[PDB]
């Protein structure tokens, strides 16, 4: 009976090595710790978010401190296209002379790392020009992290620790988060853009000792309150304006040209300030929707139980029974966590899908490796958030769901036909894999036997209609913003498409990624992607809806979320838990984003190298994906160190091979299972006891690690090997052809 772990008693009395491991993996499941009340649960959720916010701020201050200290922001900012950003310095005391010389790069006088995060472009756009501005930002974020470490400690003191009623005050939190956390913050950000970022992109230096005196507009503070709002967009930046200088600059601070800045190939800063200003007002308005304590507002609980639609008998919102859902969502933390992750998983996919097509930061479209890494980062982040959104759906069904409160509501109607949903995800998955693999390997066979004209090539004429419906005149659909005489193009009653000449100038220019040209090769991958999103939804939906149990074991709710099996009886129940559907869907999530990011990378690697006709003519069959993408672009990655030398890709060539090993060692935890290793550890335990001079002896008996743990240990290696291998590929295959 050890002290550790103190949160669970029955794991502290574990005599084996699984209690050190299970303590790590249970240490944050506060709702299952011994002697926990609901009141104490939230007060530890709350106080560990402060400890999390501080880590984000200490991480962010580490970005700033290291480019202030060891970066080349001053050198970079004078030529953001031809010099590489420095991440930090290298101190590996076991480099040879070949690695010092190779990694002494980008105008540095010491080994350094090339920043592929884009923070240089982000800071250059938001108005940071000196290293000292970066340093005081780093110091401020350290102290801002301090006031959240203190606040977290503060709200565990009994006199400051909030009560359960404060946490379950859903209407008051939504009102402030909409109005203040998002509304005021985006209003404040438009304040920075108007006061600092926009003026400093026109040359004038605005700082903390300067900003109180110089107004951002000549008509400041008076055109707003009179109502003469148009004064803020009188003369905008011209098309010959060059960034961070006064030549070509205007005076408009809130103007809505749309499209791209012709010199940075990014969105206009004045167009962003006007954006967050509009978003703020919409968000602040949205934050006055729910009544807090002023009996003017909405009550979410009553918006559920309402059954009267202007006197007409209805069953609830949208004529669907939502009664009891307020007390279901409000008391469930996993329902709330599932919704939050699902909404960050969309906001992070949406981040990736928009920041490549519509680059926000200056000169980021000309930094291909940064642009490529940022997409792959946020899509992989979004894939994990989507898996966790459906993980906590499965926890929600098991632990904090009851049929009594939710009797007859919209949530209980889903369980009534959970097999109709799963059977249909099964059909779509089967449909999309038979006719995408079958169409790829038909194209393989025809190209293999020379008859490349016998490929089945389906033009994606529906997405090409979208592009034509947004402005792309390339295809010739000639409708609806491709038709200059249409109702939508002109907006006949008002003609207020001030955004349209600038946008159509950008969408119809072929040198950007905004609405890329789409061909038959793009058709097939969007069905691989659709097949991917459907199977990994099928695995997760099956795991959430069968978390309560199915005919193979109808009592899964009693066994918890993560259990191995229910023995070999009834045929065998390996991987039966709802946890094993989250485990099984990480493979499909990684696979699917290994199709999204492979397709994003190869499509852009063909545009960037000018060989666009390589992707269009060879992405329709699977060998082209294998010869023209993987085999072709590995050449300079694997030659990062050869017998004849070593270059700046020697670390990417090493992590590429590192991730192959981390991937392969995953198969050990995934293929060979527990009882093999226990009979082998039982033998090594015999050898240690019987041998002389071995004076150590285990405090806790060595056992082969458990069933649900190896599935997690092997899933971590598969993931780390999936990310180190592709991270090294994507960085080295893009930052070797180019700068």
């Amino acid at each position: 009976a050890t002290k550790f772990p103190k949160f669970s008693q029955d794991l502290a009395n574990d005599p084996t090595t699984r209690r050190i491991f299970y303590a790590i993996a249970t240490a944050h499941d506060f709702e299952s710790h011994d002697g926990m009340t609901e009141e104490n649960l939230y007060q530890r959720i709350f106080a560990s978010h402060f400890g999390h916010l501080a880590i984000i701020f200490l991480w962010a201050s580490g970005i700033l401190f290291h480019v202030a200290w060891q970066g080349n922001f001053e050198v970079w900012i004078k030529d953001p296209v031809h010099v590489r950003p420095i991440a930090h310095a290298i101190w590996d005391a076991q480099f040879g002379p070949g690695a010092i010389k190779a990694f002494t790069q980008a105008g540095a006088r010491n080994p350094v790392d090339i920043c592929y995060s884009g923070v240089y472009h982000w800071w250059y756009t938001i108005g940071l020009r000196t290293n000292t501005e970066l340093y005081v930002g780093a110091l401020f974020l350290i102290l801002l992290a301090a006031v959240f470490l203190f606040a977290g400690w503060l709200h565990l003191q009994p006199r400051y620790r909030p009560n359960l009623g404060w946490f379950k005050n859903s209407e008051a939190r939504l009102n402030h988060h909409l109005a203040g956390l998002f509304g005021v913050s985006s209003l404040a950000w438009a304040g920075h853009l108007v006061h600092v970022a926009i003026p400093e992109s026109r040359g004038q230096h605005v700082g903390w000792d300067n900003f109180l005196s110089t107004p951002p507009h000549p008509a400041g503070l008076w055109a707003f309150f009179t109502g003469n709002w148009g004064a803020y967009a009188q003369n905008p930046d011209t098309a010959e304006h060059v960034f961070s200088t006064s030549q070509g600059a205007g005076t408009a601070i809130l103007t809505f040209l749309g499209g791209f800045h012709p010199q940075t190939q990014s969105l206009w800063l004045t167009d962003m300030a006007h954006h967050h200003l509009a978003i703020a007002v919409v968000l602040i308005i949205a934050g006055h929707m729910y009544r807090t304590n002023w009996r003017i507002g909405h009550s979410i609980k009553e918006m559920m139980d309402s059954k009267t639609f202007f006197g007409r008998k209805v069953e609830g919102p949208f004529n669907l029974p939502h009664q009891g859902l307020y007390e279901t969502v409000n008391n469930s933390l996993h329902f709330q966590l599932s919704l939050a992750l699902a909404c960050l998983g969309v906001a992070s996919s949406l981040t990736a899908q928009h920041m490549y097509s519509m680059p926000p930061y200056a000169f980021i479209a000309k930094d291909f490796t940064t642009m490529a890494a940022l997409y792959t980062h946020h899509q992989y982040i979004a894939g994990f958030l989507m898996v966790g959104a459906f993980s906590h759906a499965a926890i929600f069904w098991i632990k904090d769901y009851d049929p009594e409160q939710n009797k007859g509501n919209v949530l209980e109607r889903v369980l009534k036909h959970k097999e109709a949903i799963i059977a249909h995800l099964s059909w779509v998955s089967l449909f999309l894999g038979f006719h995408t693999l079958g169409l790829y390997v038909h194209n393989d066979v025809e190209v293999a036997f020379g008859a490349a004209d016998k490929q089945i090539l389906i033009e994606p004429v529906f997405a090409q209609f979208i592009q034509s419906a947004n402005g792309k005149i390339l295809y010739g659909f000639h409708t609806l913003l491709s038709n200059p005489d249409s109702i939508a193009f002109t907006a006949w009653p008002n003609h207020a498409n001030v955004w349209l000449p600038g946008w159509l100038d950008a969408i119809n220019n072929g040198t950007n990624s905004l609405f890329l040209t789409i061909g038959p090769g793009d058709f097939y991958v969007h069905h691989a992607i659709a097949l991917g999103l459907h199977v990994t939804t099928l695995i997760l939906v099956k795991g959430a809806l069968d978390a309560r149990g199915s005919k193979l074991m109808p009592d899964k709710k009693d066994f918890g979320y993560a259990f191995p099996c229910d023995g070999p009886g009834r045929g065998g129940t390996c991987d039966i838990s709802a946890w094993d559907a989250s485990y099984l869907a990480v493979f499909w999530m990684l696979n699917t984003l290994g199709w999204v990011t492979f397709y994003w990378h190869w499509k852009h690697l063909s545009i960037w190298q000018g060989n666009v006709a390589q992707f269009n003519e060879s992405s329709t069959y699977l060998m082209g994906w294998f010869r023209d993408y993987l085999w072709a672009n590995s050449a300079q990655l694997i030659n990062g160190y050869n017998p004849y030398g070593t270059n700046n890709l020697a670390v990417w060539a090493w992590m590429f091979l590192f991730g192959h090993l981390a991937w392969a060692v995953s198969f050990m935890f995934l293929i060979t299972w527990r009882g093999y290793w226990q009979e082998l550890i039982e033998t090594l335990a015999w050898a240690h006891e019987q041998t002389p001079l071995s004076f150590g002896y285990w405090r806790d008996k060595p056992v082969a690690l458990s069933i649900v743990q190896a599935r997690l240990v092997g899933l971590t290696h598969f993931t780390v090997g999936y990310i180190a291998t592709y991270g090294a590929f994507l960085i080295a295959s893009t930052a070797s052809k180019f700068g």
Partner: protein, 139 residues
């Protein structure tokens, strides 16, 4: 207590380890009418004696693995003891002197639920309570 002659066995590697004399240890005691050979639960083969046999095993599963082997020699008079390191010897199998397949009087329904397994309560009912859904004093 316990006593008996140990079977003819050349000693194995699968036998007792340091857990035997430190945590606790088991002993199976049976009587055989014949001098035949049985399979050792710790690997190998040993010749069981003519009178009272005594064998020391590390865990209870081995003893009942061996006990199930003795029933194939038509021997059902074996007794399994549990030797704590301080030295006292408990009788644990068969606990009442008759084999557990048989039904006695005086044994009690222990860990019996008076409901179908289907109507165990949902985990939300026992939320933030000491009990689990399967003890559940309702029904």
């Amino acid at each position: 207590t316990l006593s008996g002659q140990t079977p003819i066995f050349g000693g194995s590697t699968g036998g007792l380890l340091k857990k035997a004399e430190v945590e606790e240890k088991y002993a199976i005691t049976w009587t055989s009418p014949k001098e035949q050979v049985f399979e050792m639960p710790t690997g190998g083969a040993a010749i069981m004696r003519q009178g009272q046999n005594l064998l020391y095993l590390a865990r209870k599963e081995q003893c009942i693995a061996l006990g199930g082997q003795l029933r194939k020699f038509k021997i059902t008079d074996y007794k399994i003891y549990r030797i704590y390191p301080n030295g006292e010897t408990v009788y644990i199998h068969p606990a009442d002197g008759v084999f557990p397949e048989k039904v006695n009087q005086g044994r009690e329904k222990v860990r019996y639920n008076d409901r179908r397994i289907g109507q165990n309560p949902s985990p939300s009912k026992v939320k933030f309570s000491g009990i689990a859904t399967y003890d559940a004093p309702n029904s």
